[model samples]
Each structure stands twice: as structure tokens, then as C-alpha cells.
Target: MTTFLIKHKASGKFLHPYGGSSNPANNTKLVLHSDIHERMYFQFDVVDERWGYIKHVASGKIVHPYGGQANPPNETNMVLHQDRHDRALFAMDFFNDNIMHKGGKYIHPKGGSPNPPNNTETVIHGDKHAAMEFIFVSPKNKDKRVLVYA
Candidate 1:
């Protein structure tokens, strides 16, 4: 699986795990960052056909939409869950982005927008819009036309 940096459509920012350390602590919620760098790259592995798991390269932990499932409440935030081997818990319904944990709960930049600036937190919500969409790519390569490979 290739590593990709996630860019938010709404804020035009990238998804980065909290802090700059090479070793990230468990359950570190994702933060919106302005720059694109190797640290923002996540190893996205697709299993079955459509379901996939997102792992932080530095942490070796799976990305979870808080609690490993969809939550209608705004309390659900995007986090790096502790268990890296728990496939069932890590498996999420993903493809492009507008990435969903399960059901309609998808990751989006919080506050909808003033087009919130960098360093803001990402949250999981049932709402669908341009704000919920994302680009999972490594534009640092080729013409940005190619990212994922089957």
C-alpha cells in the first residue's frame, strides 16, 4: 500500500496527527495542517474490495473515527487508535475520501468553516457536503493524476 497525505476540500489543509514527533502517542486526534510533508503521509491499506485501514506511518497505529465506529454525536473525533492489529476495528468504509467510519459518519473539518485555518481539529459527523470531501494523494509524486494503485 502507498502512503498518502489527506487534503481537506473545505479548508484546503492537510490532515496531520497531532505533534511533530516521530513517535506519536495513542489516541492522538488529527489536526489540520497547512503544509504537505512526509509526516502527513498515512499508509492506507485496502482490504476486501472497498473497506480499508488507515495507519499513521510514525505511530504504527490505526486511524479511528473515535471508538472504532460511527457516532451521531459530535463527540466523535478522528483519532489514532491504539490497536494496530485489530483488523475489524481498523476497517473502515473508504475509497476516495469523504472517508466514512461506518454508516454515514464521515470525517470533516470542524466549524463547517470560516474556512478554518490550520491546526484546527477534525471531527466525525453525519453531514455530507464539500466540507466532508477529501483528496487522498501523494502529489509530491507525478502530476497528481495518479495516487492509488490496485
Candidate 2:
């Protein structure tokens, strides 16, 4: 599968796991960064068809919504999990405004903060809003080929 940089619609920053550390044992804090060369690219692999695991291209870890519990509580911070656990599998539901995790939550910026600055934490929530909407831009030509849901 092709790897892509997931950019937040409001902040225009790419999703980056904290610290630039590839250690799977570390707390995988989801942060945003402006630079694309900072190890932020990910490959979306199909777990089924609609749902898939987001693998960090640099670290080889999966994008795991923390809290190993089933139907993890809303507002849980997402991290990079070493294994492809259930929490790592996410439904790739694309919408006119946002992408909803079929696992019953939305990938959102922490606190719904508008235009959050660089390194802002990203979380999972049940609420739908602009903070969760994102644009999938090709790394080859990010400026010229932006694919937004709406």
C-alpha cells in the first residue's frame, strides 16, 4: 500500500507520534508537526477492507488508540502500539467533513482547540467536529494533490 501523510484540516500539520523515538515501549503520544521530513509518514494497510491499521513508516509501529480496553473510553489519547491489536484496527470511514473511526470514535485534536499549534496532542472522541476532519495529501506532491473528504 502507498504511504501518505495525514494532515489536519484546521492546523495543516501532519500527525506525528511523540518524540521522534521509535521505541514501542514508550508512551505513544500523538502529536502534530509542520515538517514532513520528521518521520510522520504512514502506510494504511487493510485489516479487512474498510478498516485498517496505520503503520508508521519510520518506526514500523501501528497507530494504536491507547487503553487496551474494548470500546476504549472517549477522549483517550492515541499512541503507537507495537502490535496490531484490536485498538490498532480502525475503520477508514471518510465523510464530507471528517473521517470517523468505525470503532465508534473520531480521531480528533485534543480539546477541540482551533488551529492547534505544532506538537499538539491528538486524541479519540465520540463527538464529531471540524477538529477531526483531515486531508490526505500525497507526499510526492502535497501542495498539488490534496484529497479532502469535503
Candidate 3:
């Protein structure tokens, strides 16, 4: 399989694909939206043909999965919905997963269930960060997208 290079739209940082797949694992498929003022949001969707899901950047919350459903926590303060056509949608106030963990490394606050909310887990330390990947099987096979802090 070929490797696709995904970059953070704002930071220009590159994201590597996840193991056993061609799409960027987790943390890699990040979207950094920072307005000129002070508001910001980070978003990304898991692009797995077999196993993909949507996640929260700040609190590392798993909002939706392929067949399973869930509710966002008070901390996420967001709403995940599907359009009339059944496309996924997310609306939130801020980017939550500023800190994350990966490979025994702690990147975020340093004391949380890297896998909170369910269906996902993350842990990181120093410069390494690891994230959980979700899979969604869509007939359209279109790339999943997410918008944060909007």
C-alpha cells in the first residue's frame, strides 16, 4: 500500500499513517483551526475502510463509531450528529486534546485514561504521541472530515 502524507493545515506539520493501514493513524490526521483573535479548534477523522471513528482533540472523547453510538461528555461540550443523508457532523467550542499520550509517553495533562469515553485511547510523553484509530465503512468511500471549535 502507498503512504499518504497528511499535514496540519495551520502548522504545516506532517502526520504519518497508522499501522496496518494507509491512512494516518490518529494524532496525525489533525486539523488546527485558530482564528486571528483567540478561538481555536482541532479536528480530524479516522479514514479507515474497515475501522474508523471520530474523536475529540482536547479530552480525547470518542463521539461516534461505525455502528455504535455515544454521547459527548460535559468536558467535550460538543454535539455529534448526522445529516438527513446520514453524513456525520460535529460542533464544539474548543480544541480539547491539547495533551495526549503515545507509546508510554505522555503528551497532554499527564493524568487521564488515554482511552476515555470509549472506542479510543491515547498516551504520549516527550515528543511522542499515540492515538486511537476508528473505522467507518461508507459506500461512498469518501474521506471523513471534522471541524472543531466552531
Candidate 4:
């Protein structure tokens, strides 16, 4: 039961759902919070050995990177969708550095947007190791972390 904050290595921000909304359709956004307990906590629910749904602790919703039988184009906004769907499952790869959604889109910040302001849109991108790289940081000790590569 290792719960940690999903941090974007580049911007030093945490992955958070918009407005701390607990609804299923809430959109995921990036935010800079001095405290980890505010609204950036997450826990993984194992779907297999290496893949699982990323649960937003605050909202209790799963990360759903758009696309399925109704394939949305890449870079679609990543949002909190209801739990219990294959699209919500992400392959935890690169030793926890990157999460690839079932739709084949990598968790990424919207492109061309550097030093994104608080609540900047987060979307799925096709590139690796770009701004997409993230690190799982422990709340107790921020120093204890692992880099997620593209």
C-alpha cells in the first residue's frame, strides 16, 4: 500500500484534478502545492502485475486518457473518468517513470506550453521523455523518489 504524489519532474508540480472536484468527468490538471496532502495524493489499484488504474485520492476517480472504440485523436485532454473501464488502466512502465494509457497515449502536459501556469491543461502526448516524464515522490520524504522516463 504505497501511496505517493505523482510529480512532474520538469515543472516540479503535482498531478491534481481540477477544482478538487470529485465528479467522474473532472479534468486532470497540474498544480503547485507546498503540501502534498492538499489535493495531489494518488494510489494505484493493481489490475495486473504491472498495469493498474491511477486513482485520484481526493476524487476517488481513475485517470482516463480519452479513446476507446470511439477513438479520440491523440493529445486529447486527460480527465478523471469513472472507475471500472479498460481505458482507465495504464501500463506502469520505465520503473514508474511513465504511465501509458490503454489508449496508447502517454501521460503528458499539453505541448508548446512551458512553465505551465497553475491548472494548465494536461493531455496525452505521443512523445517520450519530453515534459511527459514524471517522478513518484513520497509524501513523508520528497527526496525519496523515482524518475519516470518516456
Per-model TM against the reference:
0.81, 0.86, 0.21, 0.79
List per-candidate RMSD values in Å. 3.1, 3.0, 15.1, 3.8
Per-candidate local distance difference test: 0.66, 0.72, 0.25, 0.66
Candidate 3 backbone overlaps, count = 23
Model 3 TM:
0.21
lDDT of 1 by residue, 25-131 (tens): 77788888887666777776665455567777776766776666434466477877766443323333235456765445677787766376877888877787777
Lowest summed-lDDT stretch of 10 residues in model 4?
A: 26-35
Better of 1 and 2 by TM-score: 2
Per-residue lDDT tens digits for candidate 3, residues 57-91, read 33333323223223322222112223211223322
Question: What would you estimate as the lDDT of candidate 3?
Answer: 0.25
Evaluated at residue 130, the lDDT of candidate 1 is 74
Name the candidate, 1 or 2, with the larger lDDT value: 2
What's the lDDT for residue 122 in model 3?
24
Cα deviation at 89, candidate 2, in Å, is 1.2
Backbone clashes under 3 angstroms, per model: 0, 0, 23, 2
Which sections of candidate 3 miss by over 4 Å?
Answer: 1-20, 24-63, 70-87, 95-150
Best by TM-score: 2
